């Protein structure tokens, strides 16, 4: 729980992006001209008032000051988007000069700064999208061996979601092999954007080919997720790290918000919204309230603050 | 790059050296000054001041320096030896140094190359044409090269002098016959500020072939 401060660059010669500082003097690692590549830069609030005073004397950029005891990724993003009246923001940069130990921010994408100039821009949407994450396990299937959609209304609602310019990401924790048969039974390849599998487990991520039968164009959902917590518990969170990774692999580079729809609250690590799926061995046809929830969650920022 | 700020620090120390003597008593470009006898004493004082700065940055822990020593300019091979255009001497208390100007003058003449060599730029509209849209100081790289060259030239001399002072004439001769002590030694007491010294920066070798 700390006070916090942020740079706002005068000329966003590169836009949307933000950086995080351990020292005000870290600027020396950045040196000449490199500063023009970042729109904002957060720093933990000065302990010495002279630092803040020198900041106040500096004219090279605008700045803001605030309290954020809420040491959370999404809450900090909310506060910054409030301060700078902006719906969408870029990635958070990092250097070999290791970041400050604000390691509660551990679970996120980390941008090796030099890539920033190398970054592409993407066709995939003409406007900045929202994103929604889904599962197979007990999720929107009926629970029997052969599954209906909980409503064909939902079936077509998935398609219409494209009208809003929002992204559909399914990561089955369930086993890889059966999902192909599942989609052959009911195909949403024309209805859904992104597919991932085998997330069920956390595994010892420490230092110590597919589509042979039918020409699917899928991939090894490679196990590249850290143990990340080095502790005795039982949790397999959905990983914003991996999600943003595959997004930028699809050149998806900016977004307004991300929501999770899942049967496990535990896996939600401060996702913007969570929809606990109702378990359903029969077609509940309840979707309209899910629709309402999602629509209002989207609408939150039409007032220019999520609340 | 992590290399980048080290390069910037090196450039910074360079310019920090340069400007002070580029303003104090600075009449004309180095070549113009050295071309002729014109104030041989000015050339002497310039070299002395350079040595003073070198002693400063090598041993800044104590800034004081004995200002008193003698200068000799000479013009003939009889008056000079290859490889050491600067030579320190001591005569019955008379600490003196000697230099052949023409050697160094000839030296500071071939710096005519250009660096069409390796990667830079990252040529991009974003790199350039993006800011083509939207939004007496006279110095040049060749002169900076010349001056850095002369500085590195004086480095050898200064190290020779320091050792001669600290170890006496015998080791002065010994080192002149064999600079192996120079061979691969950052190791020092911190008072040398050995990282300040430009031997640490870049490396060279010959291959004997055919």
Swiss-Prot record, chain A:
Gene3D superfamilies: HAD superfamily/HAD-like (3.40.50.1000). One of its GO terms (cellular component) is host cell nucleus. The keyword Nucleotidyltransferase does not apply. InterPro entries: DUF705 (IPR007827), HAD-like_sf (IPR036412), HAD_sf (IPR023214), HAD_SF_ppase_IIIC (IPR010033). SUPFAM superfamilies: HAD-like. It is found in: Virion; Host nucleus; Host cytoplasm. Keywords: Host cytoplasm, Host nucleus, Virion. Pfam families: DUF705. Interacts with VP1054, VP39 and VP80. Plays a role in nucleocapsid assembly and is essential for viral replication. Distributed over the cylindrical capsid sheath of nucleocapsid. This is Uncharacterized 38.0 kDa protein in P143-LEF5 intergenic region.
Swiss-Prot record, chain B:
GO terms for biological process: symbiont-mediated perturbation of host cell cycle progression. Signal peptide: none annotated. The keyword Membrane applies. GO terms for cellular component: membrane; viral envelope; virion membrane. It comes from the Viruses. Its main location: virion. It is found in: Virion membrane. Keywords: Host-virus interaction, Membrane, Modulation of host cell cycle by viral cyclin-like protein, Modulation of host cell cycle by virus, Viral envelope protein, Virion. The keyword Metal-binding does not apply. Belongs to the baculoviridae E27 family. Acts as a cyclin-like protein and plays a role in the modulation of host cell cycle. May promote G2/S arrest by interacting with host mus209/PCNA, cdc2 and cdk6. The cell cycle arrest is characterized by an intact nuclear envelope, concomitant with sustained activity of host cdc2. However, viral DNA replication still occurs in the arrested cells. Interacts with host mus209/PCNA, cdc2 and cdk6. Forms a complex with proteins C42 and p78/83. This is Occlusion-derived virus envelope protein E27. It comes from Autographa californica nuclear polyhedrosis virus. The gene is E27. The chain holds residues 38 to 272 of 290 of the full protein.
């Amino acid at each position: 729980q700390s006070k916090w401060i942020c740079l706002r660059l005068n000329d966003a010669i590169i836009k949307r992006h933000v950086l995080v500082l351990s020292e005000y003097a870290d600027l020396k690692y950045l040196g000449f001209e490199k500063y023009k590549f970042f729109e904002y830069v957060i720093f933990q609030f000065c302990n010495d008032p002279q630092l803040c005073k020198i900041i106040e004397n500096n004219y090279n950029y605008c700045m803001q000051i605030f309290k954020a005891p809420a040491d959370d990724m999404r809450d900090i993003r909310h506060n910054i988007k409030r301060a700078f009246k902006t719906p969408v923001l870029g990635h958070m940069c990092v250097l070999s000069n290791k970041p400050p130990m604000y390691s509660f921010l551990k679970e996120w994408f980390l941008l090796p700064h030099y890539k920033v100039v190398s970054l592409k821009s993407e066709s995939l949407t003409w406007g900045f999208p929202h994103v929604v994450v889904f599962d197979l396990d007990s999720t929107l299937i009926t629970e029997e061996e052969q599954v209906e959609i909980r409503d064909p209304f939902v079936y077509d609602s998935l398609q219409e979601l494209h009208e809003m310019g929002c992204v559909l990401v399914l990561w089955s924790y369930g086993s890889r092999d059966h999902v192909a048969h599942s989609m052959r039974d009911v195909d949403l390849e024309g209805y859904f954007d992104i597919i991932i599998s085998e997330g069920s487990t956390v595994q010892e991520e420490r230092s110590d080919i597919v589509d042979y039968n039918l020409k699917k164009r899928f991939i090894e959902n490679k196990f590249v997720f850290d143990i990340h917590n080095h502790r005795s518990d039982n949790n397999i969170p959905k990983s914003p790290k991996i999600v943003i990774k595959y997004l930028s692999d699809k050149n998806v580079n900016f977004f307004k918000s991300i929501t999770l729809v899942d049967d496990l609250p535990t896996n939600n690590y401060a996702y913007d919204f969570y929809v606990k799926v109702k378990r359903c061995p029969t077609p509940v046809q309840d979707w309209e309230h899910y629709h309402n929830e999602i629509i209002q969650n989207i609408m939150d920022y039409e007032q220019y603050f999520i609340k | 790059s992590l290399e980048s700020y080290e390069t910037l620090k090196i450039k910074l120390a360079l310019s920090k050296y340069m400007a002070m003597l580029s303003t104090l008593e600075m009449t004309q470009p180095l070549l113009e000054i050295f071309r002729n006898k014109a104030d041989t004493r000015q050339i002497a004082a310039v070299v002395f001041s350079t040595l003073a700065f070198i002693h400063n940055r090598f041993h800044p822990l104590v800034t004081n320096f004995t200002n008193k020593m003698e200068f000799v300019v000479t013009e003939t091979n009889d008056t000079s030896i290859p490889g050491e255009p600067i030579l320190f001497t001591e005569n019955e208390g008379v600490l003196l140094c000697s230099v052949d100007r023409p050697s160094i003058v000839k030296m500071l003449s071939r710096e005519f190359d250009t660096e069409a060599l390796v990667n830079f730029e990252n040529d991009n509209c974003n790199v350039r044409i993006a800011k083509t849209f939207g939004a007496d100081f006279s110095i040049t790289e060749v002169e900076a090269t010349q001056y850095l060259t002369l500085l590195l030239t004086v480095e050898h001399a200064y190290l020779h002098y320091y050792i001669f002072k600290n170890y006496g004439v015998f080791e002065y001769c010994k080192s002149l016959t064999d600079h192996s002590l120079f061979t691969n030694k950052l190791r020092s007491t911190m008072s040398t500020k050995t990282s300040n010294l430009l031997l640490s920066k870049f490396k060279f070798t010959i291959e004997d072939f055919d």
